[PDB]
Design a protein around this ligand. Sequence first.
Ligand code: 3Q6
Length: 276
Amino acid sequence: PPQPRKKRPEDFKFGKILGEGSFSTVVLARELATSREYAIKILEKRHIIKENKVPYVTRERDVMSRLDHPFFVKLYFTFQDDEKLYFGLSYAKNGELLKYIRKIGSFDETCTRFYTAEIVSALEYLHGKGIIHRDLKPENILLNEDMHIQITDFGTAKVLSGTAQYVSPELLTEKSACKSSDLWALGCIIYQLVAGLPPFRAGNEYLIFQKIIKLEYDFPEKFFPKARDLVEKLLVLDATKRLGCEEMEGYGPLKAHPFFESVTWENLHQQTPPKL
Ligand SMILES: C[C@@H]1C[C@@H](NC(=O)OC(C)(C)C)CN(c2cc(-c3ccc4c(N)[nH]nc4c3)nc(N)n2)C1
């Protein structure tokens, strides 16, 4: 089945910068023929070769192409010119989940519940494909125009067959990740929605890591009891004992947790999100 001919830079009107890393930049672009907006990731080939990042770039192109689900940023197309690679990605108009955390301070139980539920539902899909994110965080959990999540940033994903504050203990005591690594990250993110801050904080990276391996953190007095219980079943040193992992029999027990009592799991992206 014939695909549309290769696109090129001149097919777009480029606008503002949407995101920045030291090897790539995401720019908003409007396709002239359609007036559609895309988030185009631009990568300079020479810099990526120089910095030995080719495996990461390929990894992301491969992963983001196979993902077909509303809670994931989609890769629509790729092209390149003499110097640059272009990835046409979903444009998540409302930006980072991190922004909303900073904006409103900390979520109420209704919003925490709904967004956690979406995240859990996205991970179930992802893990179902034998893919592990490895760098899940509020920065790359984006929000669509409709205020549903869209997860992105897959260069560091692992196909089976990170950021200091969200790093799992196994990554510090063995250097080997699994699906439970994502579930640990999830426990950190839930904590952050409720409290307004990540669980493991310190003056520098070394001190942060030191806290992780000791499981040194605690709950504010004001912290939804059932959310606290859930977090405590995710933030567990033993990776095989995190709710949701294969050795704990997967996503059934996770979705059945009392914190999610009122959630309808089947059609989350069709539900109207709670107002922030
Ligand atoms: C830009 C930084 C660094 C980057 N790191 C990288 O490319 O690392 C390599 C090793 C070179 C592969 C990962 N970044 C991203 C960022 C976005 C993104 C950002 C905003 C968006 C919006 N508003 N709509 N859509 C969006 C997609 N999407 C992906 N996929 N990645 C974040």
